[PDB]
Amino acid sequence: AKTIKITQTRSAIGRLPKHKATLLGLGLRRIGHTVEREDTPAIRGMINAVSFMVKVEE
Amino acid sequence: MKVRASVKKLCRNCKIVKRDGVIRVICSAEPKHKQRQG
Amino acid sequence: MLQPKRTKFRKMHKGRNRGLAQGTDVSFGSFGLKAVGRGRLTARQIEAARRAMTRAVKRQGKIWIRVFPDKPITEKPLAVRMGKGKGNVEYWVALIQPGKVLYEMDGVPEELAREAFKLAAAKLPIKTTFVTKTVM
Amino acid sequence: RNGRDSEAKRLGVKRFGGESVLAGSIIVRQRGTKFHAGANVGCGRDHTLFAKADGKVKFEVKGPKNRKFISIEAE
Amino acid sequence: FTINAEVRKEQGKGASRRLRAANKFPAIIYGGKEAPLAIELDHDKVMNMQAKAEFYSEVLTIVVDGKEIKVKAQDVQRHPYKPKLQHIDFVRA
RNA sequence: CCGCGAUGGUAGUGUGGGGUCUCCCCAUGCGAGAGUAGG
RNA sequence: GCUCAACGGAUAAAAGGUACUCCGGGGAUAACAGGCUGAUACCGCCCAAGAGUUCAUAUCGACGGCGGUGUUUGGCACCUC
RNA sequence: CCUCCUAAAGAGUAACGGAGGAGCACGAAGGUUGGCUAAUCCGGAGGUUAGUGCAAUGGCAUAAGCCA
């Protein structure tokens, strides 16, 4: 079962509460923070929700 | 001279000419038809 | 000067004027004057334009008005403050969206129709274009 | 001459489809029968629909008139 | 009337608006037993053709890939206020 | 059990971005109503 | 047993004047002037009904349309009690 | 105090915003069983377009309408 690397690229300041909750769900804490997560539809949906401020290395 | 925002040919003898960045109507027939855009 | 003969209510919310028009085809006549811009047409403007085009054709052919001013517009008098209830109805408007055929004409040549609608369009606050009936 | 209104009545659906309810639980408050009482659902004097058994709420469209019924599917 | 057409790869609002920005427009061929075929047309070429009134009465040929489909124009969606075509329905003749 | 309907296009719209910002456009996702073929 | 209706109902029981005034406060809030706005006002322009013997445009510009100024009457209550 | 809209398709939601009502009535106009179905136009057509004790909204033929 593969994993993917997700990096936060923009600030959470001024984003919608749902977007901040999604960053918390991915475990992203600050700009440039990279996390490794399991590649699932649930994880991909979180990436999709905040795709404007994260980058995936898959 | 008629000084107007809308300048146009009023007869067949009217001619549109641009002189020094100004649209003008000159007429060989009728001095009343002379116009400057302004 | 057009106005609903009666209405269920006297005053109406301002609302907004988004979207493209319904009634974008020449449905009755041969030629049409179509709105390309967005805005309000007052009953007075509609009448002024009608008179201009009607005079131009010299009681020849037939003219349709496709728009009707059914929206009442209120105004507050001079030297009254804000609030104290909604103002009094002063005039009626039709909301116009881009594409709305405003007037139609039949039973004249195209050249005379173009001339008549040019004279009408000068009375209107919205940009317009000349249109003709299509097969489809 | 205006300036009046009444208190809002908090009508509407209280328990949506698939929700587990106890007997007595109000499912919908309404004016008249906008929804109708199906299986294991009662209709109060103010047209409130309430559960007569424990179970899951089920909305359904049945009858010749094609009416919205609410039932409880017993657990 | 012969119309050259390409089969569409992308569909929907985004794809369709991109077509029209590139001076093409979407169309559909339907009717008969065969499934509907979504096509792209050149705007200027078809706009010039359909100015002629015979375009709407007569049987047309649409050349798609290397196959000639006989059709009639069934419906046209025009731009609300510009001399432009948004979409055409063609019925198989 | 309870007497219609694709395909395509159009309208709208969640999120992000933009403009000439009373209104729109772009990327992406969702996508009618009406009508058409047909049943 | 309450039009305690000022309807969560100060008392069983209550109107006014003050330019003779007074205190505590407020630019939380008005009068002056500034500011924002520009409906109104004023000025300019577009279309051309027509008037002008003839002739829309010498001159005037009906029905309507678009602006500019900050310039009247106002709106707001941002500064100063 | 009640009804509708504003109110952004759960609830709620302001203005000296837009519109209307209440301060009751009824021992039947309540309970139940049985029976019945309107407006309107010209027996027929039509199908609730009527009715609801009284505003408005949502309901009501299994009628909540209507009679014994």
Next chain:
RNA sequence: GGUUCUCCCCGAAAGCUAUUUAGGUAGCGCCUCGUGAAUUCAUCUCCGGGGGUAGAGCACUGUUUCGGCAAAACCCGAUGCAAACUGCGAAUACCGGAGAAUGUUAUCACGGGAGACACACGGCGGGUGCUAACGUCCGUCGUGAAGAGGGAAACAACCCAGACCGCCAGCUAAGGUCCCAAAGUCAUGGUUAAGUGGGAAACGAUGUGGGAAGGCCCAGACAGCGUCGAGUCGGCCUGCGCGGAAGAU
């Protein structure tokens, strides 16, 4: 009005309801401290739900125009319009269920201590006003309030971004790279001649670039057409400019 030493952690509100209440106060909401407790809570995915908004539509309730028909009713065809129209109807949002990952329990209850109940601007959806106001009143999100730093000349509320302390290290964001002033007088292909860029509309015009299609034309076009020797005419669409354009140290 004023309220006196220090550091560390968390951190509001300017709302609802009631009030002889409205710049006061009370309960609730939001802060803090303590205690206890469930996969309690959030994000996403999938599943179960109710919608009547946006849009649309015109059977209904009103409104509307044309034609036909005819007691100009009614009816029919054609065309629109609606916050208080709906024979249709989204996106979202909301309720519930299941599953994973992530999150310092982020959740709920009870108890000790509050503060707050003048909000502001900006975005979106609206009422009001003139789709006037740095106007006013709601909903919802953001920021300011209580938030420094960089950008927008200057500029709480906009854009970027959340300052534990030190560094004469490095990479970036918005925004920039001729000089003031850090970094391209960078590369390639176009456009503009107005200092347009670096205010302003209806409307006016052989400005100038691009595109598709027409009419006429060596049976000689377009002014000369009592003439000689190839273009010529004027619509359409579109890029960038021009006039329209007057204010007080």
